[PDB]
Amino acid sequence: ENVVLCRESQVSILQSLFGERHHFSFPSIFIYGHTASGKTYVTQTLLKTLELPHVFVNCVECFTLRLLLEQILNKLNHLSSTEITCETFNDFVRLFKQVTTAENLKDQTVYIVLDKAEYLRDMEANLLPGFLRLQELADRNVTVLFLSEIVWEKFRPNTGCFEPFVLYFPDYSIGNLQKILSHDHPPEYSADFYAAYINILLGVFYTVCRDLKELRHLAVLNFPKYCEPVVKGEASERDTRKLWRNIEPHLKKAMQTVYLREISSSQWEKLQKDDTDPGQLKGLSAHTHVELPYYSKFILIAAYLASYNPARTDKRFFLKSNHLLGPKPFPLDRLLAILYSIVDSRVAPTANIFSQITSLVTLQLLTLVGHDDQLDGPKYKCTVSLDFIRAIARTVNFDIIKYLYD
Amino acid sequence: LSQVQRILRERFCRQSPHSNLFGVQVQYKHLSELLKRTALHGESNSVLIIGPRGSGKTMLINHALKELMEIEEVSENVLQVHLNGLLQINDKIALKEITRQLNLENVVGDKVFGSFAENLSFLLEACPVIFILDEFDLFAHHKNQTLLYNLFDISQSAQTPIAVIGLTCRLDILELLEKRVKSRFSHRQIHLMNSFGFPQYVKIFKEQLSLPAEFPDKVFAEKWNENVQYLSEDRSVQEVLQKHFNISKNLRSLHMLLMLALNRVTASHPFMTAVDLMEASQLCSMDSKANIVHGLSVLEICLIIAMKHLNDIYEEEPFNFQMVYNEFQKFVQRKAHSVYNFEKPVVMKAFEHLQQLELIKPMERTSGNSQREYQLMKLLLDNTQIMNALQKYPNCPTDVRQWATS
Amino acid sequence: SSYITAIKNSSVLEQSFLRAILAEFRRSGLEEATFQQIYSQHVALCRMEGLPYPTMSETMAVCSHLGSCRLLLVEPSRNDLLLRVRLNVSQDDVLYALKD
Amino acid sequence: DQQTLRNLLSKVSPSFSAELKQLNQQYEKLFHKWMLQLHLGFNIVLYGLGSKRDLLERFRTTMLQDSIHVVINGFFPGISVKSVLNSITEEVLDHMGTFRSILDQLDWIVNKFKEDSSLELFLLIHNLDSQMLRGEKSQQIIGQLSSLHNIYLIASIDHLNAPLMWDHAKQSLFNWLWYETTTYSPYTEETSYENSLLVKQSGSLPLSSLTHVLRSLTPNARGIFRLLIKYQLDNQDNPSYIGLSFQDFYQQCREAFLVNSDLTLRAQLTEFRDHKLIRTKKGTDGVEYLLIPVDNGTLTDFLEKEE
Amino acid sequence: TSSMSKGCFVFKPNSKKRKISLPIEDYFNKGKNEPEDSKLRFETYQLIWQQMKSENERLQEELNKNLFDNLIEFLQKSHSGFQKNQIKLREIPTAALVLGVNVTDHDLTFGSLTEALQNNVTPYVVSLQAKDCPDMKHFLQKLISQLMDCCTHYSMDSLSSWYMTVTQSPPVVVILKDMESFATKVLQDFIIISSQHLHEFPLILIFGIATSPIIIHRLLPHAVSSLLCIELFQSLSCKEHLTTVLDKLLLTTQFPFKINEKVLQVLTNIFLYHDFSVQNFIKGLQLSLLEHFYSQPLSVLCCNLPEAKRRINFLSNNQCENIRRLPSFRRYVEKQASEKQVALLTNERYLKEETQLLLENLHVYHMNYFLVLRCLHKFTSSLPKYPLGRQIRELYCTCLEKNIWDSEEYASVLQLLRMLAKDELMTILEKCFKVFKSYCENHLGSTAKRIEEFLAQFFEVLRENVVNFIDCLVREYLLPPETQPLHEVVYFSAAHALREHLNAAPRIALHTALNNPYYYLKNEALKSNIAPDICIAYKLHLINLVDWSEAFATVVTAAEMNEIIHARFIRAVSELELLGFIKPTKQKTDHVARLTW
Ligand SMILES: Nc1ncnc2c1ncn2[C@@H]1O[C@H](COP(=O)(O)OP(=O)(O)OP(=O)(O)O)[C@@H](O)[C@H]1O
Ligand SMILES: Nc1ncnc2c1ncn2[C@@H]1O[C@H](COP(=O)(O)OP(=O)(O)OP(=O)(O)O)[C@@H](O)[C@H]1O
Ligand SMILES: [Mg+2]
Ligand SMILES: [Mg+2]
């Protein structure tokens, strides 16, 4: 139900610093760790196991100071046992001392866990030194835990603060990942069979991924495809090499599509179920073609020539150190000069054409830099790739690669 | 034993008073003379205590006000008002606290006073008052320093005896104050700097790690004291104390080290040992960025080695995804064949993960003005950190390491 | 003054940090510095003195301790290895305080 | 020359007078078509060479008499969409209160026009392309206003790149019908003569001129000035104890990473003396002011609009 | 009144309690021709416009039904996971609704969608927009406002409290209308907050995406894009909606009003070339309707045929002579017999009968023309090479401008059609015979039993006979409407005025007015020095201001102590900056040529 594996030393240290209920612990512990290292899971299981009064608060949900303080105080008032309101930090400290004096909570360490705490440094300045010194300010035997992915030195305010004990939850190596993934074996099939499956999956995906959640989800998805030989009967439980040879090319296709989330999980399990092979689904990518009006097409392939070409060469290509650095901003007069040059027919400066130039920007196809003097508005940039402009130029029968560079 | 743990945990975790004072006798003599001058006579005074973080400024005022309170016929007539910068950020909340701690919230009624000074004059008219202003520099950043001016003006002018003690850790505290309030301020400064040598540090070690004389289990108490004498004279304990002394001479870090070494002591292992201080010193001295880079994937390490070559060649010039991808392409062709030969989206996903950990930083911060590529970013790792982290990188393929050396 | 006796009663690594700042300012001839050059000189001074090799999270702790007081005013810690470090007290005062 | 001297020399008369006298009643003929197309759900924008102010004012006199109409001056420097929202809310409607935001007040007046159809309002804008009403938020608020069926809007544009303001989303809101009125009247009202090459400059800087001089400058310099703008703002609350000091300014601007040396700040305060921005009252026995002469409300409205 | 140092002047009709206003009909008649005619034409306009508006809004509801069937199927599939579920790390189901480039018509496309959901899946559907959600607090405030409307420091827990209050079962559906315009931070924060608590608050998101779906990658990072189960959907094409609405508004004989060829070219060019917005086409049709019923007095006769002839029967004398002086009738009497020439002009009672006969002839000409048009389109689409057009509207334009067989284009479609397979011809005449089925009350029933005979035959000689059959048909019934008498009653041909009102060019007007003042001032002001001052300065600068000042002084003194010429230069240069031609630089006193044309 609630097993923690390969975290024995870390749970030993937390259980040591918590100690006894009457004893006073550190005013603050700052747990930091690389992603999917079991911060929330280990802390929640340990706090639930020991039966300590504790509050779990996520700071992403509490984007306002009032919401954070209100959430903490209401959850403590439910732990003690209608609606208490607190606008400021001082009202939090007064009402916090008020709710802490209940008979169940007079003589026990009251924990306030704050998960995803890197969003506490974007809020009010007194909030984070206020929470670090909460045992000093309130004097009510209170311990706060900050869980984060970010190292401690970035958090430090300019005026200093009550420095906390910085703890490190280490990453899972290959063995720890194998003995946490193989633990929840399917009841139908052999445990060694599922263990060899985890061995080949970790063999493929260790290089690009060391995240527990992503590997567990990819192990869930690709498992019916793995046991299809033993279901069809062409191979048995102990014919490991045949099973690995079957699933070895398929795992690369699952790395290039599902791992990048091009094709959703439901479409993927449909592909393994109905036996339709992958590679026949376009996915969210490869749909880079948008049906655009004629003038907006020529404006866009003129702004790409304005942005990615130096002004010194502009004379040679049109009147008669690379793309690596990016798009160079251009003035609007260059856009109109290129637009009038490349279009074969006469173009009049109508209201609709300027409305199209200021529309591409709203549709995030173009982008203005500066954001100053909107009526003059000369500065613009092109945010689209080579293939999109090449496809549009091919549609209206224009040779973009002749004009880009020699 | 439990009682030893309880007493020493209140000594280390909470900053609870202990009897002796280390090298602050003259400063305390000044402070106690001015408090007895204010309380016994009718003189009104102002003090601005200056000292670095954790140098016991609150220790001095708590012990001085405690001995002041011990004096007969002082306790009945003296009122205290504790105000703090981190709690009260605006002067109306400060006014609310000054009414509330003086127990005049019933007396003040519903009347709204025309001026701030009139409200303070009404409050003080219904017997000396002491005003401990913690975090004085946070009071100094108010809108026009109204509360500080009114407090200093009432102490200078009004008959009502008032002492205004302020606590700061800034040596420019008399440059933040505006010209009128410096003139109203009597220049009395008590500097609590950490002026003690290394043998005095070892003496504070042995004084702070020893049991009190009112401990009931006396027979265990004397052998615990003889044990901490032998521990203080030990060589390796002296070495780890020297390593902690070189960083800082602040007793808060010493109490953290002693708490960790104390917390290792259990029922089976009933006495402290040199290896407890050595391991507790090993826990504190961890390097954070090496712990993060240890957690990374292999592909993110290949990206970091490419970024290190980019900053090596084009020195102090920012980069985008395209240059690091091109250098990584020179890797995947130049060293190896058909190994590490990934596509662009998975490399982009790894680069975006490096951005998530804040090991790279966007040089210019805009609001959606730039696409994901062509965005100029800087590396937040020094070269020697990268070499140290690759040095003990678990099983780093000889290919990537040989790329890293050259 | 307060700043001179504050520098004199400071620890060993803070004084070596202030010496790295002085030598790096002599090298640069400017009143500001990126934290990288200060750390690269501080490594060499710790090697010369005989002190052990300082990790980045100890040097950042020393720098934020000096910046917590006003012997030095630096940028917010949010940006790392990219700070602007300037002296708040005069260089001759620093040499007078460290010469003892 | 002076701008006052420009006001004095009004002796000249137009050469083609009889020729240009027939170009007014010709456009006066189209008034019934314009009023009818207002009632059917279209809006009219006028584009031309001369001043359309007299034509719109004659349109007010002849037709829009027995209606609750509102005239808006884009050419006035001290105008904002907040002001036109106040003008709709407080006198046209009988509300007497303060609203939290411009969007919250816009939704209140929009809802007020929803529950009742007895209200009809005619909203004239003499220039819709002026600097104050150039913002996309401003045109978004005006587009939310004009799309109702109980309110009508006639506006004129003068600038050559006016069609850049509206895209396909915004011009869906405005049912524009473009009518050319190429009269030849001079721009006597809309040419303020301020920040022109006439050397005479009157009073405190208007907000448009303050912004225009302040944009073409170093970003550090914008910060340096914002410091004193915010200080002078918190100091001006009573006339007593007014004035900053130059050593105190060096302290505040060294705390922040803006200025490196004192000579750099002296060079900066001379650059502000160059554009008549700073008033150096240093050497005064009480305090060495270094204050700004620009009106305080204009300073608040600049700082809120600056980003 | 309007000149004061403030920016808002509000005039009210207060202290005069006569708030009665003119009815709209009074604005319609600005002349003294015939007021009863001018009040009846305004009722006819409103009737025809309501009919076209209702027909379009029914048509769009009919067209996009197929997309909504698949989308309701997907939202019925997705909620089964919440019915089983104990979050079990469930993802937020989302549908990427790839709409078009156009932005104007989307407000229709979502609205029907909203109603479809309120009939089928949920009773709780709310729509949000990027313009009124700058931050998370406003986002959640409008979320809990529309959720409470569908049935104070609001938080996601307060949303779940409302949900457990009201349900005590359906999902809640949030439609993000404009995916492009949202701030990145509020999207990532809403996804991360909502993902944790979805087990008590079921949430299904539709993203309204104008461009390609790669925008989902651009705004949302990979750490947030893996919290969504995403399924792609594609909407209508703009071209298909255009051809459908043209077939159901113009080409139908139900509506009496029509448009000319050049008006159709203008409205098709401003669509194909600038923006694929059908609502601008509906705007152009409304404007053409308003100008046709506002200009022509005899357009009261433009109605359905019973009402048309009862309106013919009772007319004023002035309307009768307006009929008599119409150019189509004036050439009609010229080809008519010599007794009948004086018979029409002298007697109005003969005229009232003759116009009824001519209007009925025009209506049956339209019915025959459109039926033969659909059959010719069946032959046109069946051919591979697509000569005249791919679509119905290109064919209608090219037949409407000039006779097709008069042009040499039609010989190509004949010679391609003449060599053809038997099965293809069987399919073609099956399609054509179900076109003759499609429109009842035919006046071409002889052709219907003929094409029954050639279908009943089902070689190269009868292939030649059926191709010559459609050839004789297309010579017989398709003719341009200008060759029909009394056609200016139901036709509107004012291309240039419509082009100027819809698609203006305010830079050409300024450039022409400054370079040539003689067009608007015909008082001998230019042939290839006497001009308004703005013209004089404008011609000279095409740039230091003092040399420009002395050049202007020289020119205006050639035209005639003078201080006034320098003052005129100050005014002229100041009013040139208000029109965007002069920009102050620092190299000289000034040097700028940003017009560059
Ligand atoms: N030892 C373990 N045994 C079983 N499951 C585990 C173990 N460690 C972690 N998990 C899984 O990891 C998840 C919790 O990971 P956690 O949220 O702590 O990662 P994180 O590093 O906090 O992620 P983030 O980078 O988002 O902060 C749980 O769903 C749990 O199932
Ligand atoms: N000279 C000293 N004499 C006695 N105890 C000391 C001394 N220096 C430090 N301490 C101990 O170290 C801790 C000092 O922190 P304390 O709360 O007393 O003030 P502080 O932390 O300096 O105040 P602030 O939080 O404002 O910096 C206390 O536990 C105190 O017992
Ligand atoms: Mg977590
Ligand atoms: Mg303190």
Author numbering:
A (entry chain E): 5 to 85, 92 to 330, 348 to 433
B (entry chain D): 17 to 142, 152 to 431
C (entry chain A): 761 to 860
D (entry chain B): 268 to 574
E (entry chain C): 3 to 87, 94 to 159, 177 to 193, 212 to 501, 549 to 618, 625 to 638, 644 to 661, 673 to 709
Paper's wording?
The complex consists of six subunits (ORC1-6), with subunits ORC1-5 forming a partial ring capable of encircling DNA. Adjacent ORC subunits associate in a double-layer arrangement through interfaces between the WHDs in one layer and the AAA+ domains in another with ATP-binding sites sandwiched between the ORC1·4, ORC4·5, and ORC5·3 AAA+ interfaces.
The first of these, ORCO2WH, consists of a dynamic ORC1 AAA+ domain that is unresolved in the refined map. Interestingly, in this structure, the ORC2 WHD was stably bound inside the ring-shaped core of ORC in a conformation that is similar to the auto-inhibited state observed in the DmORC structure. Only in the ORCO2WH structure was an ATP absent at the ORC1·4 site due to the displacement of the ORC1 AAA+-domain and consequential disruption of the ATP binding site. In fact, this conformation resembles the completely collapsed ORC2 WHD conformations in the ORCO2-5 structure where the domain is further tucked into the core of the complex compared to the auto-inhibited state.
